[PDB]
Write a protein that binds this ligand. Structure first.
Ligand code: S4M
Ligand code: S4M
Ligand code: 8QO
Ligand code: 8QO
Lengths: 266, 278
C-alpha cells in the first residue's frame, strides 16, 4: 500500500510506501492516520491529519526547533508560554529546554492526537508529562477567550482569536504561528500579516524553513522597534545549543531573508 | 510510454518508498536521445508548474521554479568575482544559467558546452523563456562532452566556470584565471551530506583555496534540497558576502529570487550540516 498526499492548491501528488498501518480512524475532530513508512527510506513513523502529513520522525526537528526557538530566543525572558495545538509534544519539548520557562500551557482540541503521539512518537511526546507543562484538551479559540490579560510571555500557534492572543500576551509578548508556504499561498501570508498587524501587533516578520520535502512561521512582537530578525537571547549562550540539529542564530537571521518575489511580506 | 491524462512518476533510488507524481496534460517530447531519455510535457494547467523537463525520469526544469536555481547559479558566482569577463557553462543546454550570466555587463563572452544537442533543440522549442539566451552573439554554444572540452582548454582562460549537470576538477582549476570562481550543482544536505563533505574536501585538496555550500529554497524537490558549491581559486576571498552586489547593477529589480540578502542567507546551514561551511 501507498499513502498519497494531495492539495486542492492539483495535478500533483506525493506518495509514501506504508510498511505498517498503526492507527487510522476519524476522531471527534479530524481523520488521524499513523503509519510506519518504508524501513529502507528515512521517514520513520508518519502522522497525517485529514490526509495532510503533519509529523515524520525524520524531519520533525525542523519545524519544532524553529517554532520553539525563533519565538523564545526573540523574547527578553520567556517565563509563561502557551502552545495552541502541538498535541504531538514537539514544540513543547523545544520550549522546555529553556531554563527561563517556569510554566507552559498546551491546548490541543483533539485528545486522540496526544494519546496517539504517546504511543507512537515517544521521542516527541515525552514532554507532555513534564511537571512544568499543563496539557488541556479543548479549543484554543475558547481557551484564549477565557484567559486573563497579561498571562503569557509567548503564544505559539502550532496548528476575534488574534485580538485575544494580543490581549493575553504581556506588553513584551511574542506570538508565533505556523505560516503557509510562500510558493503555495503567498496571497494567504500577505493577508495574515496585514491581519495580525491590524489587530494590534507592532511588527510581523515571516521566517522560512528548509524541509526535506514540501512551510515557515510568522513571528509577531507586540512592542515596535524590536527587530525579531536578530536573536535577542542567542541560543549559543545557553547550555542546550549543541543539542539542536537545525536551529542556531545564523539560521534565525537567515530565515527572514525571503526570495525577492516574497520580500514585501517582511 | 507517457500519455495525456496519465501521471508522470518521479522516483529516486537514494530515497526508496517515495514518489512525486505530476499529472500530464500534453506530452511534448518522449524519446531517447544519443545520451539520455528526454521527456518534456505540459503539466496540469490548474497546477503551477507549466511545462516540465525530465532527463532519465528526473525533472531538471519546470517553468514555475526555473528562476530559482538559474539566478542562484548565475549571480552567486558572478557577484563573487571582481570582473567576470569570460564565462564557461558546462551542461545547461536549456540556456537558463546563460540567460542570467548575460544580464551582467562585464561579461564579454560566455562559452556553453552541453553533450546533448537534443536538450538545446527541445529547449528552443518548448521553453523559449529559458533558451532565448542560446542565440545571443555573446554566447558560443557547443555540442560536446565538458570533460573533453576542459581537458582541451588552455590554462587561465576563464574568470568563472559553472557546472550545471545531471581529474576533471584539476582541469577546472587549471583553466580558471588566478581570480577564478568555480560553481557547481551540489547534492542535497538531506539526501547526501557525505557526498558534499567528500566533494568539498577533494575540491579544496585539488587546490581551490575556499569552498562554501549554498542552499536553495525550491517549491518541491523529492530528493531533499538543491545546493551549490561555490569555490575560489585565490585565497582570502569570502564568497559568502557578495563582492559585487547586484543592487548596484541595472538589472537587479528584474530578478525574482536572488539578491544580496538571499546570497548571504544561502550559506547559513542547518546545524547538522554547518561543518561543511564552518
Ligand atoms: C499535530 S500538530 C501538527 C504540527 C506539527 N507539530 C497540529 C495540531 O493542531 C490541533 N488543532 C487544530 N485546531 C485546533 C484548535 N482550534 N485548538 C487547538 N488545537 C487545535 C490539531 O488537533 C493538531 O493536533
Ligand atoms: C538541463 S541541465 C539541468 C537543469 C538546470 N538548468 C543538465 C544538463 O547537463 C548536461 N550534461 C550532462 N553531462 C554532461 C557533460 N558530460 N557535458 C556537458 N553537458 C552535460 C545534460 O545534457 C543536461 O542538458
Ligand atoms: C516525502 O513525503 C513527505 C514527507 C514529509 C512531509 C511533511 N512533513 C511536515 C509537513 C510540512 N509535511 C510531507 O508532506 C510529505
Ligand atoms: C511537482 O513535482 C516537482 C516539481 C519540481 C521538481 C524539480 N524542480 C527542479 C528539479 C531539481 N526538480 C520536481 O522534481 C518535482
Amino acid at each position: 500500500g501507498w499513502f498519497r498526499e494531495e492539495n486542492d492548491q492539483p495535478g500533483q501528488a506525493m506518495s509514501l510506501r506504508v510498511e505498517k498501518v498503526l492507527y487510522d480512524a476519524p476522531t471527534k475532530f479530524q481523520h488521524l492516520t499513523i503509519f510506519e513508512s518504508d524501513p529502507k527510506g528515512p521517514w520513520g513513523t508518519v502522522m497525517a491529519l485529514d490526509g495532510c502529513i503533519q509529523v515524520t520522525d525524520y524531519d520533525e526537528f525542523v519545524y519544532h526547533e524553529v517554532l520553539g526557538h525563533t519565538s523564545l530566543c526573540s523574547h527578553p525572558k520567556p517565563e509563561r508560554v502557551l502552545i495552541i495545538g502541538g498535541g504531538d509534544g514537539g514544540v513543547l519539548r523545544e520550549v522546555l529546554r529553556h531554563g527561563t520557562v517556569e510554566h507552559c500551557d498546551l491546548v490541543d482540541i483533539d485528545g486522540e492526537v496526544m494519546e496517539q503521539s504517546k504511543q507512537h512518537f515517544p521521542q516527541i511526546s515525552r514532554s507532555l508529562a513534564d511537571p512544568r507543562a499543563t496539557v488541556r484538551v479543548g479549543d484554543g479559540l475558547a481557551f484564549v477567550r477565557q484567559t486573563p490579560d497579561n498571562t503569557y510571555d509567548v503564544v505559539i500557534i502550532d496548528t476575534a482569536f488574534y485580538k485575544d492572543v494580543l490581549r493575553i500576551l504581556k506588553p513584551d509578548g511574542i506570538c508565533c504561528n505556523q505560516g503557509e508556504s510562500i510558493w503555495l499561498d503567498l496571497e494567504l501570508i500577505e493577508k495574515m500579516s496585514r491581519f495580525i498587524r491590524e489587530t494590534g501587533f507592532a511588527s510581523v516578520q515571516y521566517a522560512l524553513m528548509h524541509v526535506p520535502t514540501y512551510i515557515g512561521t510568522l513571528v509577531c512582537s507586540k512592542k515596535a522597534g524590536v527587530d525579531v530578525t536578530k536573536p535577542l537571547r542567542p541560543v549559543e549562550d545557553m547550555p542546550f545549543a549543541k543539542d539542536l540539529k537545525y536551529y542556531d542564530s545564523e539560521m534565525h537571521k537567515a530565515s527572514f531573508a525571503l526570495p525577492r518575489f516574497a520580500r514585501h511580506i517582511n
